Structures are given as C-alpha cells and as structure tokens.
Design a protein around this ligand. Structure first.
Ligand SMILES: [Mg+2]
Ligand SMILES: [Mg+2]
Ligand SMILES: [Mg+2]
Ligand SMILES: [Mg+2]
Ligand SMILES: [Mg+2]
Ligand SMILES: [Mg+2]
Ligand SMILES: [Mg+2]
Ligand SMILES: [Mg+2]
Ligand SMILES: [Mg+2]
Ligand SMILES: [Mg+2]
Ligand SMILES: [Mg+2]
Ligand SMILES: [Mg+2]
Ligand SMILES: [Mg+2]
Ligand SMILES: [Mg+2]
Ligand SMILES: [Mg+2]
Ligand SMILES: [Mg+2]
Ligand SMILES: [Mg+2]
Ligand SMILES: [Mg+2]
Ligand SMILES: [Mg+2]
Ligand SMILES: [Mg+2]
Ligand SMILES: [Mg+2]
Ligand SMILES: [Mg+2]
Ligand SMILES: [Mg+2]
Ligand SMILES: [Mg+2]
Ligand SMILES: [Mg+2]
Ligand SMILES: [Mg+2]
Ligand SMILES: [Mg+2]
Ligand SMILES: [Mg+2]
Ligand SMILES: [Mg+2]
Ligand SMILES: [Mg+2]
Ligand SMILES: [Mg+2]
Ligand SMILES: [Mg+2]
Ligand SMILES: [Mg+2]
Ligand SMILES: [Mg+2]
Ligand SMILES: [Mg+2]
Ligand SMILES: [Mg+2]
Ligand SMILES: [Mg+2]
Lengths: 70, 116, 87, 101
RNA sequence: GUGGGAGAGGGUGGUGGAAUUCCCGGAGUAGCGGUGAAAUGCGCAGAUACCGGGAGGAACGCCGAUGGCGAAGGCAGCCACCUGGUCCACCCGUGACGCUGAGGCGCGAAAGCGUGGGGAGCAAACCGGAUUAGAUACCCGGGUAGUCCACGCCCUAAACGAUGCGCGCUAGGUCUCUGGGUCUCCUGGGGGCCGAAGCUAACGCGUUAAGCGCGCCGCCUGGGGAGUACGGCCGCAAGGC
C-alpha cells in the first residue's frame, strides 16, 4: 500500500483549517492513522495529532464515524 | 397496519444473547425478536442457532407490515453476530447496507472487575 | 515573563564596566530578579510545588555567590547588598 | 503583546441584520480588549463534521491579532456570551511548519 | 551572556466529543440480565433493544511507542495565562566561586482521618443468590464509607534500576529521541539491545559500570523471638521514626 506523505505535496503540518489534506490522514473512522500508514517522522506525527484534534473541536474533522462493512 | 416497506435493522449481539429490532427510516421500531422470544431460555440464547432464528422471526414479522428493503446496524461482539447477518440476507429482505456502530467509549467510566 | 528588554536593563545598571555580562554583581542581580518574579508567582499559586524547587536552587545559587563576594572584596558586597536590599 | 488567531463559529441562519450585528459586536469586544487586528479571512457556510447545536453547518470567522497576553481568557469569556456564537477557539500564532518539503 | 530548541514538567482558569447512569417524550411487546449450568434481581405501574431531547459526575479512545518530561512520588482531550527544569550553537563575560552532605526545613502514589461539599460508574464492610462436605471465598445480583473537589493532618511501599551522589579514565557495533553541523555521515545530551579488556559465587554487568580509581553521606554483622517490649519524639486517631 502507498503512504500518505508519499502521495501528497508540500503542505503545512500546523494548519488545522485545511481539511482536504487532513481528511487523507484519517482512516475510514475518525481515527488518526498510525505512523506505518502516514509515512511521517517522530516530530511530524506529534504535530499532526495536535492539529487534527484542533480541527475536531472546530467541527471540521470527525471524532468518530461508522464503518460500512462486515 | 403501517406499510413501511423500508427501514433499518439493529442487531445487538452479546455473549449471553443476540437480539434484533426492526424499525423504519426514522429510528422508530416496528417489531422485534430475541433469543428469549423463541423457545430458548438459558445460555442457549447466545448461540448462533438462536441468533439466526431470532433474526428470521423478526424478518417474517416485518413482512406483515410489508418490509422489503432493509438497512442493517450491528452493535456488539458475540456468538451469532455473523449468523444473524447471514440469516438476514437470505430472509427475503433485500439488505441495503451493513454498518457496524458498536459504541466504544474514550475511557470515561470504570468497568466492573469482570472487564479488567 | 522576563523579556530580553528587561534583561539588558539589569545588566547595564550593574555592570562593572561596559560589556561585562558575567560579573558576580551581574549574576546576583539577574538571580534576584528571577527570585522576585517567582516570589510573586508563589504568593498566589501556593499549590505549585515543582516551581518551589527551582526557587530553592536560585536562592542557594544567589547565596552561593554572596558568600564568595564576602571573602574577596567585602566593600562591593556591602555596596551590592545595600543596592538590592537583601539580608 | 503576542500574536494570536481567533476562530469563531456561529449559527448559519442569520440574515444580514443579525449577521452584521453579531460581527460588529465582535468588533466592539476587540476594541475594549485592545486587539490590533492584522488580517481577516471569512469562510462562512461550511459543512461540519458532526451536529453542533442540532445544526449541520456553521459560519466561520478568522481573525489575526496582536494584543496583551493577560486579557486572553477574559476575551474568550466575552465572546461565548452571545447566543448565536457557538465555538470560540483562540490559539497563539505559530510558524508554518512544512512537511515533505 | 547571547541566540535557538524539545517536552502527558507544574499551577490557575476555561473548554470539546465519545460513553455509562438517570429524567422527559416518541415508538414498540414478553422478557431482560447473568453463568460451567443456574438462581436472588428487574419487567404489565410496559423494562431490555431503537430514535429524539435534557441533566450530572468522573475518566481521556485513536495519536501511543520497546517514546517523552520530572529529584523521587509521579505526569496523557483541547485552549490560554502564570511558571520550573534541562539541552545544543557562539568562545563573549566572571576567575576555583567546586563536590558531598550528619541536623534542620520542604516535597512525598494509594489507603486512612477532620470540616464542608459532591455523588454517574466502580466498590471494603454488609444485604442476598449460587458453589460446596462446609463458603465467613473465588463466580452473580444489589450496595455504604471511599474513590472526585476545596482546605488542613497522616510520612508508610516491591517509594525498584531491589544498583546513593559527583567526577575522571577504559574497544566497538546497532536501534532510538532531540539539537547542531562542511547532512553516505560527523558531532553532543538522554533513552534501549548486543558485546573488548576487566570484575563477580554464579546468573549477569560492561562509556547510562556492578570495570579501574578518588571524595563524602547512608547502612550491614546468624534465623526465630521481632520491627515486638520499654522509653522518647511526632500524630485528633489509625499509627509512624
Ligand atoms: Mg443467557
Ligand atoms: Mg453560545
Ligand atoms: Mg503541562
Ligand atoms: Mg498542567
Ligand atoms: Mg419512557
Ligand atoms: Mg418478580
Ligand atoms: Mg413485577
Ligand atoms: Mg413488581
Ligand atoms: Mg444528579
Ligand atoms: Mg496505547
Ligand atoms: Mg529523564
Ligand atoms: Mg520553559
Ligand atoms: Mg574566554
Ligand atoms: Mg582576567
Ligand atoms: Mg546537592
Ligand atoms: Mg537530610
Ligand atoms: Mg502522602
Ligand atoms: Mg489519597
Ligand atoms: Mg475524607
Ligand atoms: Mg456494580
Ligand atoms: Mg460485587
Ligand atoms: Mg449456602
Ligand atoms: Mg559505592
Ligand atoms: Mg540534521
Ligand atoms: Mg548515547
Ligand atoms: Mg573475557
Ligand atoms: Mg557484587
Ligand atoms: Mg548486557
Ligand atoms: Mg563509573
Ligand atoms: Mg536499622
Ligand atoms: Mg558477628
Ligand atoms: Mg539473634
Ligand atoms: Mg511496622
Ligand atoms: Mg528503656
Ligand atoms: Mg511507644
Ligand atoms: Mg498523644
Ligand atoms: Mg502498621
């Protein structure tokens, strides 16, 4: 499988308002993807987590979703 | 007496029992069934045979009000959670979609000693 | 907090000469200012215990240098203490 | 004075009489708290990720200011007063950290 | 000093969603729950399951780690204010100002105590149901103190790296966090794994020493009796040194 950072551009990791890119880092559910799937580094994932939680409080990124399978 | 012909179905699967509710697109229920509704009484309620029969009893009850198209909602892990779904596709009800909405908390309440 | 503007104001007042950043008078001045920034932060927030530890080390370090100033040149010690109102 | 970013989401059902009033009330509160505004970005009608106040959307406002630091939480308390005002999030400004540069 | 840096470090206020419980309403019949099987329990005054609305308290899913911070205890939503520690680049300033540390003073999970609150979930004691030769238990249904908050006591622990602190010296390899750099790498400071010399009774340790040395504090001298008795200090008590 491809990874997120691999298939992307030059983006702002601290911008909580850009949802179109922050949508790519969420799974089917509202969960934050592990590092093995984002292709980020240690310092990068720590910022991504905090900026995703910000976008959640602004009603932009969902806390949880519903899996359509099984 | 309702003529709904479309709606949702909620499968509440536990280790001790599996129970089915059939509703309309708004969330209000029409009929339902469970492992105790059919003859099974004890631990036989949380068995896949029970989950299957419980599903098909509710499915025929929904035929009375005329259900044809059905959406599926599943909550909980337990024996027969899949036997209920497999029973639901071949129940005659055309199954529209199948969603797992099992509620998981963000670690808010302290569980009983059993779950730790 | 303590911005670099207020910082330079202290060094230039207590410098033994222009360009002096590390005199014993300069360090004790700098230390005392952080003492007073903390003593007013600990008047309120009396339950902030971990910050109470850093304060004890500064007082130790502040008295560490005065006990050194005493031994070498007691005049500048008195001129320093009288200027900061200590002890 | 430090630099901050203001995020305000309010009820996306207002006409122009109530929208201009809510916003000029926002401008009134920034004057009393001394927030020199540097620039503004207005998105408005945006699809929310979950129901907020039974409403599926929100009207978004963004201000960038430079104000005294001590009066921040007082300002946050001043904006949640209005009924139409729903979400108030204030963040200290930060540098645009780049990834995959 | 100057200029940068990372962080569940601390304190104060504020704030977000999931979930449990409870109330209101809509809708809807005959059971739910729970176990190795069951039964007390709850359900026709209508539960469980479903939808909507409301309230309250406590805890922070994913990120999340063999990870980070802190002197130890210990510290996870998010925002802001106050704030501590520490590390790197410059080679700028002072000129031995250092290390340890008997007392003293301050901190100190949980449990317990006081006054006043708060009380959703969990839960000693206890009320029941089972199991059993018996059940004063593991398993099940209920449930008070308490857990949470504010203020003041209590001073114990497997408080664990069962390794006191500081410094110097003594092959490397590899994984990692974070800085700087002429950025296959080099160079610091932490956090892991192998292992030279060497030590150790052996297991094992090995630039994070348990090696080689030096300084200072603490403490040990057979088991039971016994962390008991007496005395003293402390404590409201329980009890601690
Ligand atoms: Mg059963
Ligand atoms: Mg409001
Ligand atoms: Mg913190
Ligand atoms: Mg804190
Ligand atoms: Mg009701
Ligand atoms: Mg009865
Ligand atoms: Mg009854
Ligand atoms: Mg009755
Ligand atoms: Mg209540
Ligand atoms: Mg985890
Ligand atoms: Mg550490
Ligand atoms: Mg700091
Ligand atoms: Mg020099
Ligand atoms: Mg000289
Ligand atoms: Mg010392
Ligand atoms: Mg001592
Ligand atoms: Mg204590
Ligand atoms: Mg306690
Ligand atoms: Mg109490
Ligand atoms: Mg209970
Ligand atoms: Mg119990
Ligand atoms: Mg008996
Ligand atoms: Mg030794
Ligand atoms: Mg680099
Ligand atoms: Mg290292
Ligand atoms: Mg050998
Ligand atoms: Mg030995
Ligand atoms: Mg080893
Ligand atoms: Mg050594
Ligand atoms: Mg002894
Ligand atoms: Mg002897
Ligand atoms: Mg003896
Ligand atoms: Mg004892
Ligand atoms: Mg005696
Ligand atoms: Mg005694
Ligand atoms: Mg007494
Ligand atoms: Mg005792």
């Amino acid at each position: 499988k491809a990874k997120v950072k691999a298939t992307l551009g030059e983006f702002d990791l601290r911008d909580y308002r850009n949802v179109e890119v922050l949508k790519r880092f969420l799974s089917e559910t509202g969960k934050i993807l592990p590092r093995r799937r984002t292709g980020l580094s240690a310092k990068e994932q720590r910022i991504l987590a905090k900026t995703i939680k910000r976008a959640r409080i602004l009603g932009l990124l969902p806390f949880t979703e519903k899996l359509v399978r099984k | 007496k309702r003529q709904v012909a479309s709606g949702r179905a909620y499968i509440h699967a536990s280790y001790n029992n599996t129970i089915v509710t059939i509703t309309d697109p708004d969330g209000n229920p029409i009929t339902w069934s469970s492992g105790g509704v059919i003859g099974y009484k004890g631990s036989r309620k949380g068995t896949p045979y029970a989950a299957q029969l419980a599903a098909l009893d509710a499915a025929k009850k929904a035929m009375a009000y005329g259900m044809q198209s059905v959406d599926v909602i599943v909550r909980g892990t337990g024996a027969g959670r899949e036997q209920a779904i497999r029973a639901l596709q071949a129940s005659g009800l055309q199954v529209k979609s199948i969603v797992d909405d099992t509620p998981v908390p963000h670690n808010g309440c302290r569980p009983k000693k059993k779950f730790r | 907090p303590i911005t670099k503007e207020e910082k330079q104001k202290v060094i230039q007042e207590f410098a033994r000469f222009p360009g002096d950043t590390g005199s014993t008078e300069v360090q004790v001045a700098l230390l005392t200012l952080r003492i007073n920034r903390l003593s007013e932060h600990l008047k309120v927030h009396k339950k902030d215990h971990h910050s109470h530890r850093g304060l004890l080390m500064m007082v130790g370090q502040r008295r560490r240098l005065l006990r050194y100033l005493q031994r070498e040149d007691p005049e500048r010690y008195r001129a320093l203490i009288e200027k900061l109102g200590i002890r | 004075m430090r630099r901050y970013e203001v995020n305000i989401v309010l009820n996306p059902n207002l006409d122009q009489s109530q929208l201009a009033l809510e916003k000029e009330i926002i401008q009134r509160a920034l004057e009393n708290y001394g927030a020199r505004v540097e620039k503004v970005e207005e998105l408005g009608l945006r699809r929310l990720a979950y129901p907020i106040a039974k409403d599926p959307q929100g009207y978004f406002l963004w201000y960038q200011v430079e104000m005294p630091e001590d009066r921040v939480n007082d300002l946050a308390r001043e904006l949640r007063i209005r009924d139409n005002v729903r979400r108030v999030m204030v963040v200290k400004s930060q540098e645009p950290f780049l990834a995959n540069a």
